[PDB]
């Protein structure tokens, strides 16, 4: 028993069990998509300038 | 007046009235008379201040 995949994991995953699931492996990034409406556009002299 | 000096606070080029200038002036006699735009640049909310 070469030990297990929790202490073994490149870039500091925390494998856990009853979904075999890794966790917080701190690599990649994620893109986002922000699709906002024209409703929360403030306009200027209604905020501190 | 004397001395009136015109900054812009908001500028869009919409449709309906979307720009604030505010005059900071410093007037004789406090009573309101009429402002204007002679060019076709602007267009005036109101008559008078």
Same mark, same amino acid.
């Given at each position: $028993?070469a030990?297990?995949l $929790?202490?073994?994991?490149?870039?500091?995953?925390?494998?856990?069990?009853?979904?075999?699931r !890794?966790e917080?492996?701190?690599?990649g990034?994620?893109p986002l998509?922000?699709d906002?409406p024209? !409703?929360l556009?403030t306009?200027?002299?209604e905020?501190?300038? | 007046?004397? %001395? %009136?000096?015109?900054?812009?606070?908001?500028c *869009?080029y919409? @449709?309906?009235?979307?720009?604030?200038?505010? *005059?900071?002036?410093? %007037?004789?006699?406090?009573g309101?008379?009429?402002?204007?735009v002679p @060019?076709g640049? %602007?267009?005036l909310k109101?008559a008078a201040?």
């Amino acid at each position: $028993k070469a030990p297990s995949l $929790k202490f073994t994991a490149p870039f500091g995953c925390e494998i856990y069990t009853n979904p075999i699931r !890794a966790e917080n492996c701190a690599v990649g990034s994620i893109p986002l998509a922000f699709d906002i409406p024209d !409703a929360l556009f403030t306009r200027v002299s209604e905020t501190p300038t | 007046l004397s %001395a %009136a000096e015109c900054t812009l606070n908001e500028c *869009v080029y919409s @449709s309906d009235f979307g720009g604030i200038a505010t *005059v900071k002036y410093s %007037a004789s006699k406090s009573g309101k008379c009429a402002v204007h735009v002679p @060019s076709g640049t %602007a267009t005036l909310k109101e008559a008078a201040v």
